[PDB]
Amino acid sequence: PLSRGKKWTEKLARFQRSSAKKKR
Question: What DSSP assignment string belongs to 8-22?
């Protein structure tokens, strides 16, 4: 589950946007 450190995803949840909203 969090053996990944998704707390980081928070940053991508904010930066991954680059592709997170490929059709926004």
Answer: GHHHHTTTTHHHHTT
